[PDB]
RNA sequence: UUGGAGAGUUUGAUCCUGGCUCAGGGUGAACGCUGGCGGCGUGCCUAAGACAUGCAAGUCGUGCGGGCCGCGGG
């Protein structure tokens, strides 16, 4: 199993004649605080189901973290759209110093110690992938060698 | 590398741009409601407007010559 939390629940509406018509958006993200993460935006007619599909695509997307004494290896900057998530290396104590969106994806990976800042647009979804695709592109010491 | 959190609000809904707004810290402060003690600070930011009264720069007889009161005594 994993931990889960919900990051975003939000409620989307479409016309049509006779009225609006609703539909619910379920970002979440998972992990187990030892390394491993993943983002899952999932929609549905209802709430629950949307948490649930949303928890589900949540596993099938997934990112292995290269902590290191609970911080990150590097700093990284990632543009995703109009969004921008900086992440920052910090020392034992710093605590994560995080807006909700990238803290639920860092703490669940694990990550107990990084500086971070939201720059650009801040549109938590967007922020969201920005801070996966950030994690992502994480090098060690090693991947770095090896590479090259 | 001791260091970096954001949120509300334009739409039926969206993403973006973009302003406004807020939570933080600060002060020679002031105003309200309330008000027990102590310590260290600290208190005319405006009229460099106008000020009653006291006080804030004097001292030396080991520079000099006198006055006035007295002490010692012809
Ligand atoms: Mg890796
Ligand atoms: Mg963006
Ligand atoms: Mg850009
Ligand atoms: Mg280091
Ligand atoms: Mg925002
Ligand atoms: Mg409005
Ligand atoms: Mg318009
Ligand atoms: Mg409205
Ligand atoms: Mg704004
Ligand atoms: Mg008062
Ligand atoms: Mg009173
Ligand atoms: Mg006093
Ligand atoms: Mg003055
Ligand atoms: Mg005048
Ligand atoms: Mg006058
Ligand atoms: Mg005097
Ligand atoms: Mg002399």
Redesign the pocket.
Known sequence: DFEEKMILI??????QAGG?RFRFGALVVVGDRQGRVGLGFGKAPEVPLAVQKAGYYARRNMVEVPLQNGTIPH?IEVEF???KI?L???????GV???????AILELAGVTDI?????????????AYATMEALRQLRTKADVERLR
């Open positions: 939000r409620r989307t509406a479409r016309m609006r700093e759209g109009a969004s900086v920052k290396p910090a020392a034992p104590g710093t110093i995080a807006g909700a969106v990238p803290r500086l971070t800042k939201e720059l650009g647009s801040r549109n938590p979804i967007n922020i």
